[PDB]
């Protein structure tokens, strides 16, 4: 009765990428047990962004992950108190993105607060020059460690030219109240930009994610 | 297995200060990897002591020093054989304390044998007049030299009047068998007199020490 079959969320992001500050407000909804969700993001400060939206898209929700019966859903059980997660995204050309996030339940809907810092992106690189077009389907290797849930992803960004722009992602998920940790398993993730206006100040996103045993 | 996370020790000190000979027997315990230890010291001969206890307190244990992983623990690795150390403490008014010590492992617990000589202390100085009240926190800069570990400390004794009384301390630590030497690093030390009777024939001490790089 806490995490219903349909759940909305609101998200606020305060970010800086290569010294460019910005803020993003978003509203979303999804079906957390089916692993599907959508969201509409709006740049409320610092728009238009001079960098590629794709480095921001995976920072806007792992309560919306489909899980088999024998995999304890650590993040869903953490509510109504919620959880926090911290992430480092290291790109192949030295680009670095770090994210901290607070997830909570207020008035029957999820509340997401995101702080992001991106630095060291080359001025002629694909991120700074807006030469990417979407993430490829990824598999997050999840496992417990030191009382928290950790995830590793080797993510690939598609380039408009035709190549691939690689990144290595590590995230730590920690419930506010101690709950049952799961074993090691994988999470298949497909993240799609379903729509966007010309300057990417209004972006629609869809994500489908499901857990499977190794 | 040799140095457990909890270790007891026994210490015996034979010493002379400005011609006054004495013996001190004590037992202690601590957690060597966390850098903490306590001891109860008892003057068994030559009591009550006519000089400040504080010149004896730093002579009763550097195996109880917390080290980061990147700093090899020279003194821990010296066991079960153990190590010896020699120290000269030069006070600002000419007072001198020289110490030699043997550290061994017997029946799963440390055995400390100490020999101390204190000379040239003024008759009206804070040591012979018992006007000191504990050591300020100190930082022992330790470094390898000639197959041995050496340590330099500029130490300050607090006075009951409210002043300071300075000492320069040099210690050489020699493992009984050749063991790997580390680079240079600092050891922060905090030594507390936790209790004592009226004439300082029964004294309790508590020390916290941790290594870090310069």
């Amino acid at each position, epitope marked *: 009765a806490i995490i219903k079959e349909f759940m909305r969320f609101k998200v606020h992001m305060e970010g800086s990428v290569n010294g460019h500050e910005f803020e993003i407000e978003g509203e979303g909804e999804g079906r957390p047990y089916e692993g599907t969700q959508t969201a509409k993001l709006k740049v409320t400060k610092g728009g238009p962004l001079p960098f590629a939206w794709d480095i921001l898209s995976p920072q806007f929700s792992k309560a919306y992950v489909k899980h088999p019966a024998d995999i304890p859903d650590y993040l869903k059980l953490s509510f109504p108190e919620g959880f926090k997660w911290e992430r480092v995204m290291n790109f192949e050309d030295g680009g*670095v993105v770090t994210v901290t996030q607070d997830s909570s339940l207020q008035d029957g809907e999820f509340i997401y607060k995101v702080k992001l810092r991106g630095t*060291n992106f080359p001025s002629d690189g694909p991120v700074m020059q807006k030469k990417t077009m979407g993430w490829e389907a990824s598999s997050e290797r999840m496992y417990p460690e030191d009382g928290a849930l*950790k995830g*590793e992803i*080797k993510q690939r960004l598609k380039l408009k030219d035709g190549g691939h722009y690689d990144a*290595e992602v590590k995230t730590t998920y920690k419930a506010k109240k101690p709950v049952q940790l799961p074993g090691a398993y994988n999470v298949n993730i497909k993240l799609d930009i379903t729509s966007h206006n010309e300057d990417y100040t209004i972006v629609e996103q869809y994500e489908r994610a499901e857990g499977r045993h190794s | 297995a040799i140095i457990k996370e909890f270790m007891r020790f026994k210490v015996h000190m034979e010493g002379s200060v400005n011609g006054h000979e004495f013996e001190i027997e004590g037992e202690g315990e601590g957690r060597p990897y966390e850098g903490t230890q306590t001891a109860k010291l008892k003057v068994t001969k030559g009591g009550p002591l006519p000089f400040a206890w504080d010149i004896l307190s730093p002579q009763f244990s550097k195996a109880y020093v917390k080290h980061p*992983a*990147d700093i090899p623990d020279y003194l821990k690795l010296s066991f079960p054989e153990g190590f010896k150390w020699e120290r000269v403490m030069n006070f600002e008014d000419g007072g001198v304390v020289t110490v030699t010590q043997d550290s061994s492992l017997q029946d799963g617990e440390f055995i400390y044998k100490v020999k101390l000589r204190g000379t040239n202390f003024p008759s009206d100085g804070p040591v012979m007049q018992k006007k000191t009240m504990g050591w300020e926190a100190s930082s022992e800069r330790m470094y390898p030299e000639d197959g041995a570990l050496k340590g330099e400390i500029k130490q300050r004794l607090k006075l009951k009047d409210g002043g300071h009384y300075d000492a320069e301390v040099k210690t050489t630590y020699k493992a009984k068998k050749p063991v790997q030497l580390p*680079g240079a690093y600092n050891v922060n030390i905090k030594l507390d007199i936790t209790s004592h009777n009226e004439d300082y024939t029964i004294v309790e001490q508590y020390e916290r020490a941790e290594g870090r790089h310069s």
Partner: nanobody, 126 residues
Framework: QVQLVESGGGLVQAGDSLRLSCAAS????????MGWFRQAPGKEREFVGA?????????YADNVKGRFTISRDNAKKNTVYLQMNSLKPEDTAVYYC???????????????????WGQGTQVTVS
């Protein structure tokens, strides 16, 4: 907890090659980033090179570029190799492998930021 085990050192002559290995073991599920350090008999541990936890990024000290190569073992978890070519007498040191969760510019070259270390192996080049 992880336990790193080094091997492959010894005495060589100038110009020769040598291959160090850093085998890890433990209950861990994590793929760790791995860096190599070397410590002269009278100096501190100096950064030689490091490889990201996924193998996608590798960094080298200036004085070893072109001569030293670091690679992960794709078959054994958290096992890296340091291939040392064209060795010079200046390379004499005890070499360490170290592990940490992620590599950053401000931490990858600093020994104190690594939480797991190998026993070290002596490399003498005459």
């Amino acid at each position: 907890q992880v336990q790193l085990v080094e091997s492959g050192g010894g005495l060589v002559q100038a110009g020769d090659s040598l291959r160090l290995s850093c085998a890890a073991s433990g209950r861990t599920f994590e793929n760790y980033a791995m860096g190599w350090f070397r410590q002269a008999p009278g100096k501190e541990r100096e950064f030689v090179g490091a490889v990201s936890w996924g193998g996608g990024r590798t960094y080298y000290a200036d004085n070893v570029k072109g001569r030293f190569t670091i690679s992960r073992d794709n078959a054994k978890k958290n096992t890296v190799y340091l291939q040392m070519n064209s060795l010079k007498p200046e390379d004499t040191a005890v070499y360490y492998c170290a592990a940490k969760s992620v590599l950053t510019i401000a931490t990858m070259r600093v020994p104190d930021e690594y939480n797991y270390w190998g026993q070290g192996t002596q490399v003498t080049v005459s």
